């Protein structure tokens, strides 16, 4: 299979389940608290590294010892750490999760060395992201940087998966040079002014992004499973029924997998598949990174579909 | 000389400080511009605001036998607090709060109570003697209500003097309520006690009278940046804070609270001893995180020397 290049942040999530929401000026007590590893880049690395992608991951940690901590952990998830930088003087990024008794959640970003991921870091990687057969990437990293990778892997005839995450509007420079992209409801609305409620709002969303330049628009729908259309001909691929106990990193799970599965040169469908497996599992599981399953898993719960 | 001692019966934290422009909604994630982990705990910050402000306290806690908890232990010591009575939960983790605090400078708090769940009715009753021989016993409600109920009766029974601090906001039963001698609820906690919503010096003094009837002589209901609605059972007062920047207010009530007892058991008279504790609290409010914000009894005077 191809080589498969994750560029984005990396993040130590502190987790607290509660019952509801503190209200301003309020204080809440919850039933569970858990610390581990999570950020949107490295969860997406470590769902392509533990199903079986040959992954390399550009990212940035601080000299704190948290930091060393990941690094050393995400070499144990089968991915490349070499492009993983370490910044002097700045600690790792952070996030603070609240979960609500609904699943819900809210998240609170603390960018940390995340932020100094940099164009000049991803220039340093011109030669890797070229000869990548993909370049996933999401949105808890500067966007210059991602639109400076973006370009190279552009010129370089290197697939571009976008994962718009967290919701933000983008510009048509960036969106032109999209091959994937894997927006959830919000995202999409967010980015194309059309709410998602239904598989027609879906289609209507995606056009706008098709004709944006993006050629193959997948839309998380949830426990709904996603949307999935290319130039314009698309539809709803259902996911797996799961008793779900956190969400968190199901969408950056849906990513890993999905990727893995295209360089593996499965058709788009079956790797939607490949894809809302890992994720079904994930969603069964508590943090982000703890609740990424492997390749043996993934294959063991479609082989007893 | 040493005024009568107290005696500080509360929670442990290691806060987890994000700075961010607007509290983020459900489903929602947001990028904060400051991070900081500070000692916290309302237990804590009101002994440390105790300690620092001139008091001679002691403080019933429990932090959990992690690195964090030896760390506190170490830093209540230097803040001029009698740590004896902390004690260590071995298997449990000390405690820890998730903050978020938006552009106005006003917060919200997730609480994973941790080592201070176990600060249990019999740990109250290894201190009856500290509790029986103190002048004065301060409480929160970030411990378990049972033993904030058991220590309420040793210093009843003990004509040691009850001072309840009910946060975070919740109703409590008319039998606590009846052994405080003093109650300082925020405008949030007056009305969470007495079912009546405070907005002025007309419902400041309603919300205090439901208090009075339940038993509390003296009720100080805090209005933010208006001070404070003192009542001493029926005749209140208001008594204006001072005006500063605010840049963080976390701590901004348990710091007056320390700094009220102080001056308290230094025999000032209630008027004057809120003054003190408006002096110290406008301070804190201009610093950032809980017990980092505490400032001390010389930071305390001269403030005050000054006005
Ligand atoms: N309740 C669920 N049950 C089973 N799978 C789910 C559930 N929720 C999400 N998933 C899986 O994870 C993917 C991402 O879900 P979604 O909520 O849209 O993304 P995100 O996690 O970014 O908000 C889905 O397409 C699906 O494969
Ligand atoms: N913005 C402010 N300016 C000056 N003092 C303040 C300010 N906010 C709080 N304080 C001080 O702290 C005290 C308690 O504040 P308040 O908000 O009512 O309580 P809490 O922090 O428990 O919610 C006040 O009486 C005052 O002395
Ligand atoms: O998508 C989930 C992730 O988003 C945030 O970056 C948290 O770190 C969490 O792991
Ligand atoms: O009152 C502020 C405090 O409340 C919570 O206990 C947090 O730990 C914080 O330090
Ligand atoms: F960049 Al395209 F269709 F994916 F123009
Ligand atoms: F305990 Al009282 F008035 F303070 F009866
Ligand atoms: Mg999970
Ligand atoms: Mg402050």
């Not at 940099?118 to 070229?130: D, K, T, Y």
């Not at 998966?161 to 999209?178: F, G, H, M, Q, S």
């Not at 599992?281 to 390749?295: D, E, N």
């Amino acid at each position: 299979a191809g080589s498969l290049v994750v560029l984005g942040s990396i993040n130590a999530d502190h987790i607290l389940n509660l019952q509801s929401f503190p209200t301003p000026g309020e204080t809440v007590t919850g039933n569970h608290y858990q610390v581990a590893f999570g950020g949107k880049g490295a969860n997406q690395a470590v769902a392509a590294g533990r199903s079986g992608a040959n992954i390399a991951f550009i990212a940035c940690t601080g000299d704190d010892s948290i930091g060393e901590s990941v690094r050393q952990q995400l070499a144990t998830d089968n991915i490349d750490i070499t492009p993983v930088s370490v910044i002097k003087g700045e600690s790792t990024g952070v996030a603070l999760i609240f979960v609500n008794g609904e699943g819900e959640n809210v998240i609170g970003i603390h960018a940390g060395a995340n932020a100094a991921l940099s164009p000049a870091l991803v220039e340093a990687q011109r030669e890797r992201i070229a000869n990548a057969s993909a370049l996933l990437m999401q949105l808890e990293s500067p966007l210059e940087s991602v639109m400076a990778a973006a370009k190279i892997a552009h010129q370089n005839k290197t697939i571009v998966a976008l994962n718009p995450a967290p919701a933000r509007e983008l510009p048509d420079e960036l969106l032109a040079l999209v091959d994937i992209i894997t927006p959830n409801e919000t995202e999409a609305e967010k980015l194309t002014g059309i709410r998602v409620e239904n598989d027609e709002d879906a289609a209507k969303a995606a056009q706008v992004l098709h004709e944006k330049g993006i050629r193959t628009v997948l839309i998380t729908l949830g426990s709904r499973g996603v949307w999935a259309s290319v130039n314009g001909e698309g539809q709803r691929v259902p996911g797996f029924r799961v008793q779900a106990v956190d969400t968190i990193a199901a969408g950056d799970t849906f990513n890993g997998a999905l990727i893995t599965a295209l360089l593996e040169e499965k058709p788009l469908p079956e790797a939607i598949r490949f894809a809302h497996a890992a994720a079904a599992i994930a969603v069964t599981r508590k943090g982000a990174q703890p609740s990424v399953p492997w390749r043996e898993e993934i294959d063991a719960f479609l082989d007893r579909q």
